[PDB]
Amino acid sequence: MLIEIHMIQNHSPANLNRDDLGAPKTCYFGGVLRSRISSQCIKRSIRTSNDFKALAPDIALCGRMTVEAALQVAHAISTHIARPEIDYFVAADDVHIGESMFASACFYKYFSIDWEQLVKNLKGDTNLAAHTVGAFLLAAAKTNPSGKQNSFAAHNYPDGILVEFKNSPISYANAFVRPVSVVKESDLVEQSIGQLSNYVNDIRLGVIGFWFSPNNRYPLGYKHSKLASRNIGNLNELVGAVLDYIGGFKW
Amino acid sequence: VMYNLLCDNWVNVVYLSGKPDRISLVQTLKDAHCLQLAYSNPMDRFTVFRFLLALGYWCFANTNVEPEPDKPLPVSWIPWLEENKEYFELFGDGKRFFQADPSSRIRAITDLIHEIPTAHNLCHFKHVTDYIDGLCEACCIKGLLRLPVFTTVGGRGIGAGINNTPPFYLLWHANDLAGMLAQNWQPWDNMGIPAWLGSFQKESRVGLLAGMTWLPRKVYLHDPVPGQAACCSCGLPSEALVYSCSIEVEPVPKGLEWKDPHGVYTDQGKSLQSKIKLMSNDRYTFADRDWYSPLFSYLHAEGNSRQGKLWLVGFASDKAKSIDIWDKIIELEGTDTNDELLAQLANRATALNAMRKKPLRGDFKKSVGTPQIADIIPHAENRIAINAGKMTENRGYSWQDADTEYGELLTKVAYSLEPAQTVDARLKRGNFISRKPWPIIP
Amino acid sequence: PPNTLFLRLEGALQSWGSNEAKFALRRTADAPTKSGVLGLLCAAMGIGRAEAADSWLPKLANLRMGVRIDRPGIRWWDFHTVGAGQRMRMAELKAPKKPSMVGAALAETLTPSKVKTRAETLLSRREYLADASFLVALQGEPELVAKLSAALAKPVWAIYLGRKSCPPSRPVCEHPPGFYNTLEEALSAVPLQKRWHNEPLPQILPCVMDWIPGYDGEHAPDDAEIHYDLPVSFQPPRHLPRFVIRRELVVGEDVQVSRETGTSVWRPKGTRADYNNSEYKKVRAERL
Ligand SMILES: [Mg+2]
């Protein structure tokens, strides 16, 4: 059984990951250029952080030197066309013009957890496997890369999570083939979550899922569809729901 | 304990019917027209080739029979290596192949590979531990034959091979053993003494047989100790391997005017090496492999224009670490020559650096300039690079025909770099889509 | 009964490594290689890495490999850093004098403190392919294809697309297996799918096929290539050259084009209720 986490978050003007020339990392999707944050950034972003440190843990989850790690992280991708910009800065003497650059985008992320490998790596432990899964959930919901954060204080918090228990690993990145155009009667986040809605409404017509949104801000689906099993209003409650669907489990 | 190349099977070849195998040197000389040499790394495929080249040169030297094209190799080649059976041995207390007297500088048999890390190298992409894992005799032979051609410097007091920096290695490819043997048969009046004969001497200032088989290092190669896992080079499950040996460094004396036929030299006589790294610095931009360097050069000094497949081997280095080795194949016939256009084609990386480095507006010192163009350079480069043999001779594809390939990707870039909805936005995109690389001859 | 199964590969980014990477420069190939699909199928069945070489790899290596190119990728590069702020493991060990004790006898005396650590930064650039689609159609025994399809219906381990960070965005088990005589007819049988209504469509769809040995003899053609992606062992890796040909298939005569079968844009709901509709007048009258 695989536990799959769907992740939509908005981010302020900053530069978390850069290449050798310094540019914001960028992939190609849907006929245009996409803003990109590496999966090997979210790893060593969540990993070795203080909030996550709460048989040995953090080895069965993410490996180090035939460890067979049971967590897989994918490349975050923007839901609109990448729009880079370059800032001009000068230096003082208090007694020449350079260039820095930045990008702003809303990213979709995707998390997958293998339960059987996690239990096998726990030497038969089961409460510890669910404990580590919960720990990774609370870490991943509240972790950012430590990029150029002193100058661009990018400390945004998410806007929707849907969790899945499907039979085989499948992402929803193909929902963002068409780039999102902002209309007057909506915003970027609402249209992104609607594009996520009109790809889970399909497939079944053509499994279950727990959904959470903070104080139920941007409800999944723009009708009364049952595209998500339950809609919840807390991060702890969503984690407890995940543990409850795994089995009798208290947080 | 006892190992002989003529009898024991080490030559990893693939038959033309579709079955790869490992047969011996005598058997490869026997069949020689229904197979191809099967070695994934360019180094082994070049070294086994040069050893067969030296063998055929010595067989012509002591037999005086040429190998006719589209025919089996001469039969009289076989008994001469049988008579001189004592000169091809891998072990024993006596005459040894690619070995010399032992010494005290004890090193494990891992430095004989440029891709398997040893000493202070980073074993992050290949987890190797010293005096734990070793190589088989076929792998020992393969690592032995690479010292003449890919010997770079080793720090303080240790030099390179006879060619100093190993340059490009260009040769002509064919689909059977006689095919490539028969395309590079040009002999010389002076041969020399190859390395498999008696104790080599520098003597005076070389030739053909002695030129290729120069020994910058001596190797010990002790007997295979009974250590067992499988392998690490070709992964084959095998028997007792060798784990420790000796290597001493032989300096090359000053002078010694030697010209490698496959090697490529520059205007000053220095070697012409690859132009690749892992980083796009202020004086380099990462595009693809450099197939355009040894072209306004091969086409005037050695090799000239001839019909066949020109195989390019580009082996990069810096100090004592290899970074990237690649191969390529291009098709030519000899469709005239424009010296100026070949010169511009030999000088292209500076044009790419100048195209990347251009500021979007204004001008600033130490300005990196448009790094998304640095992202899209490799795709148009690899779309261009399929007809390298057609760009070289200018049959139907030109610099201007190569210029059009950038338009689609670059129009895709212009939307992102100017994501506005003004008249000025689309006009800047139109000016931006007219950026083309410009030719620089010197 | 069906004799050949079908696998669908698609993702935002993918990479399939070639022979031309023995260092920190990892280059990719144009198409998914045989070894990649063999590894994914071994993961889906759940065979051990030490077990693949024992009567499990050649059994599937006897199959015929067939790939079709729906839409090819843009060559992309990602800059990778290893060991920022940490100390890495280096390969040197002290010389144990006598050469009689080496290998496994030496490894019994190895300690965690015997190793030495170096703090540096290992830089690499890895190539990925963006927006690419492929179909893998493997022709084998009908029982073997049934076992393969049952295994990929529910994979024991998680599956990726060449590298562990490349996720599936379409089902690999989307296509049911069928019975066909040739790989060409099988690759032409699976149709071509569109995502949205107006987009470029490739008029030619390249296909990669294994070179049939024909009768006894029949030396390889001049237009065939070599490829070192026939795996014999996976720990440590052992790879074997193979013969590869290339064929092409023109769209519109042996592969059809399917419809969109869905909606791409999301858009808000309908405001602007009509005041001339009959239901409006009925509800207005009842409310009055
Ligand atoms: Mg070996």
Secondary structure class of C187 (helix, strand, coil) = helix
Write the burial class of residue C216 (CB in 10 Å: 0-12 exposed, 13-18 middle, 19+ buried): exposed
Cα C206 to Cα C201: distance, rounded to the nearest angstrom: 13
Q: At what angle do helices B406-417 and B371-384 cross, to 10 degrees?
A: 160
User: How far is the first Cα of chain B from the last one, in angstroms, to the nearest whole number?
Assistant: 58
Cα C85 to Cα C87: distance, rounded to the nearest angstrom: 7
DSSP tag of C73: P
Cα B432 to Cα B360: distance, rounded to the nearest angstrom: 9
Inter-chain CB proximity A33 and B416 less than 8 Å: yes
Cα B159 to Cα B76: distance, rounded to the nearest angstrom: 40
Give the chains touching A; criterion: ≥3 Cβ pairs < 8 Å.
Answer: B, C
Inter-chain CB proximity A98 and B413 less than 8 Å: no
**Pairs of CB atoms within 8 A across A/B:** 41
Residues across chain C? 288
Residue A185, Cα to own-chain centre: how many angstroms?
A: 26
Write the burial class of residue A230 (CB in 10 Å: 0-12 exposed, 13-18 middle, 19+ buried): middle
Asked if the C-beta of A64 comes within 8 angstroms of chain B's C-beta atoms, the answer is no
Asked if the C-beta of B235 comes within 8 angstroms of chain C's C-beta atoms, the answer is yes
Chain B residues close to A32, C-beta within 8 Å: 412, 415-416
DSSP tag of C114: G
Q: Which of C128, C163, B209, C68 is nearest to A29 (CA)?
A: C128
Chain A residues close to C194, C-beta within 8 Å: none
Count Cα neighbours of C179 within 13 Å in the Cβ-side half-sphere.
Answer: 4
Burial A135-164 (b: 16+ CB within 10 A, else e): bbbbbbbebbbebeeeebebeeebbbbbbb
Structural contact between residues C232 and C240, judged by C-beta atoms closer than 8 angstroms: yes
Amino acid at B287: A
Beta bridge partners of A37: A76
Structural contact between residues A40 and A188, judged by C-beta atoms closer than 8 angstroms: no
Rg, C-alpha atoms of chain C = 26
Chain A residues close to B412, C-beta within 8 Å: 31-33
Residue A69, Cα to own-chain centre: how many angstroms?
A: 19
* CA angle centred on C217, ends C213 and C220, rounded to 5°: 55
Asked if the C-beta of C93 comes within 8 angstroms of chain B's C-beta atoms, the answer is yes
Q: Which of C269, C243, C231, C249 is nearest to C52 (CA)?
A: C231
Structural contact between residues A24 and A41, judged by C-beta atoms closer than 8 angstroms: no
- Cα–Cα distances in Å, from B302 out to B52, B213, B297, B347? 21, 21, 8, 20
Chain C residues close to B229, C-beta within 8 Å: 103-104
Cα B261 to Cα B170: distance, rounded to the nearest angstrom: 9
Compute the distance from residue B143 Cα to the ligand 1 centre, in Å.
Answer: 10
Sign of the torsion angle spanned by Cα atoms B142, C124, B354, B421: positive
Two structure tokens written together for C101: 């004790």
- Cα–Cα distances in Å, from C228 out to B39, B171, C242? 9, 22, 6
Sign of the torsion angle spanned by Cα atoms A249, A169, A39, B323: positive
Two structure tokens written together for B349: 């990386």
What secondary structure, in 3-state letters, does chain B show?
CCCCCCCCCCEEEEECCCCEEEECHHHHHHHCCCEEECCCCHHHHHHHHHHHHHHHHHHHHHHCCCCCCCCCCCCCHHHHHHHCHHHCCCCCCCCCCCCCCCCCCEEECCCCCCCCCCCCCECCCCCCCCCCCCECHHHHHHHHCCCCCCCCCCCCCCCCECCECCCCEEEEECCCHHHHHCCCCCCCCCCCCCCCCCCCCCCCCCCCHHHHCCCCEEECCCCCECCCCCCCCCCCCCCCEECEEEEEECCCCCCCCCCCCCECECCCCCECCCCCCCCCCCCCCCCCCCCCHHHCCCCCCCCCCCCEEEEEEEEEEECCEEEEEEEEEEEECCCCCCHHHHHHHHCCHHHHHHHHCCCCCCCCCCCCCCHHHHHHHHHHHHHHHHHHHHHHHCCCCCHHHHHCCHHHHHHHHHHHHCCCCCHHHHHHHHHHCCCCCCCCCC
Inter-chain CB proximity B131 and C93 less than 8 Å: yes
Cα B38 to Cα B45: distance, rounded to the nearest angstrom: 7
Residues contacting A118, CB < 8 A, separation 6+:
A60, A61, A70, A129, A132, A133
Cα C41 to Cα C43: distance, rounded to the nearest angstrom: 5
Is B34 marked as binding a ligand? no
- Omega before residue C241 within 30° of 0, cis: no
Asked if the C-beta of C47 comes within 8 angstroms of chain A's C-beta atoms, the answer is no
Compare all CA atoms of chain C with the CA of B230 and give the residue at the minimum distance.
Answer: C236
Residues contacting B199, CB < 8 A, separation 6+:
none
Phi and psi for B319 in degrees, rounded to 5? 55, -100
**Pairs of CB atoms within 8 A across A/C:** 113
- Cα–Cα distances in Å, from C143 out to C5, C6, C67? 11, 15, 22
Is B7 marked as binding a ligand? no
Secondary structure class of C152 (helix, strand, coil) = helix
- Cα–Cα distances in Å, from C240 out to A133, B46, C27? 41, 18, 19
Cα C228 to Cα C158: distance, rounded to the nearest angstrom: 26
Asked if the C-beta of B375 comes within 8 angstroms of chain C's C-beta atoms, the answer is yes
Structural contact between residues A46 and A136, judged by C-beta atoms closer than 8 angstroms: yes
Q: Which of A104, A52, A101 is nearest to A78 (CA)?
A: A104
Is B139 marked as binding a ligand? yes
Structural contact between residues A163 and A238, judged by C-beta atoms closer than 8 angstroms: yes
Cα C139 to Cα C215: distance, rounded to the nearest angstrom: 19
Secondary structure class of C198 (helix, strand, coil) = coil
Cα B254 to Cα B252: distance, rounded to the nearest angstrom: 7
Task: Give the minimum alpha-carbon distance from C110 to chain B in angstroms, rounded to a whole number.
Answer: 10
Sign of the torsion angle spanned by Cα atoms B3, B7, B13, B14: negative
Structural contact between residues A33 and B412, judged by C-beta atoms closer than 8 angstroms: yes
Compare all CA atoms of chain C with the CA of B105 and give the residue at the minimum distance.
Answer: C95
Inter-chain CB proximity C20 and B326 less than 8 Å: yes
What secondary structure, in 3-state letters, does chain A show?
CEEEEEEEEECCCECCCECCCCCECEEEECCEEEEEECHHHHCCCCCCCCCCCCCCCCCCCCCCCCCCCCEEECCEEEEEECCCEEECCECCCCCCECCEEEECCEEEEEEEEEHHHHHHCCCCCCHHHHHHHHHHHHHHHCCCCCCCCCCCCCCCCCCEEEEECCCCCCCCHHHHCCCCCCCCCCCHHHHHHHHHHHHHCCCCCCCCEEEECCCCCCCCCCCCCCCCCEEECCHHHHHHHHHHHHCCCCC
What secondary structure, in 3-state letters, does C39-52 show?
HHHHHHHCCCCCCC
How many other CB atoms sit within 10 Å of the CB of residue C111? Answer: 6
Q: Which of C18, C25, C12 is nearest to C79 (CA)?
A: C25
Q: Which of B202, B190, B208, B206 is nearest to B253 (CA)?
A: B202
How was this model experimentally determined? cryo-EM
How many other CB atoms sit within 10 Å of the CB of residue C37? Answer: 21
Compute the distance from residue B136 Cα to the ligand 1 centre, in Å.
Answer: 4
Which of C15, C64, C87, C90 best tests the B interface by mutation, with the highest count of B CBs <10 A? C90
- Nearest Cβ partner of C171 from A25, A28, A170? A170
Asked if the C-beta of C91 comes within 8 angstroms of chain B's C-beta atoms, the answer is yes
Q: Which of B372, B412, B373 is nearest to A31 (CA)?
A: B412
Place of tokens 């050695």: B302
Place of tokens 């590069």: C77
Q: Which residues of B touch A (CB under 8 A)?
A: 127, 279-280, 360, 364-365, 367-368, 371-372, 374-375, 412-413, 415-417, 419
Asked if the C-beta of B379 comes within 8 angstroms of chain C's C-beta atoms, the answer is yes
Cα C256 to Cα C254: distance, rounded to the nearest angstrom: 7
The answer for B8, left when phi > 0, alpha when psi is -120 to 50, beta otherwise, is: beta
Burial B233-242 (b: 16+ CB within 10 A, else e): bbbbebebbb
Residues contacting A156, CB < 8 A, separation 6+:
A9, A10, A11, A12, A144
Two structure tokens written together for B360: 């979007």
Cα B377 to Cα A21: distance, rounded to the nearest angstrom: 14
Q: Which of C235, C262, C150, C246 is nearest to C205 (CA)?
A: C246
Amino acid at A131: H
DSSP tag of C65: P
Cα A78 to Cα A99: distance, rounded to the nearest angstrom: 24
How many other CB atoms sit within 10 Å of the CB of residue B243? Answer: 24
Structural contact between residues C190 and C175, judged by C-beta atoms closer than 8 angstroms: yes
Cα A186 to Cα A199: distance, rounded to the nearest angstrom: 19
Residues contacting C129, CB < 8 A, separation 6+:
C13, C14, C15, C16, C28, C30, C72, C73, C74, C75, C76
Cα C1 to Cα B62: distance, rounded to the nearest angstrom: 65
Inter-chain CB proximity A81 and B279 less than 8 Å: no
Inter-chain CB proximity A77 and C89 less than 8 Å: no
Beta bridge partners of A4: A112, A164
Cα B304 to Cα B285: distance, rounded to the nearest angstrom: 30
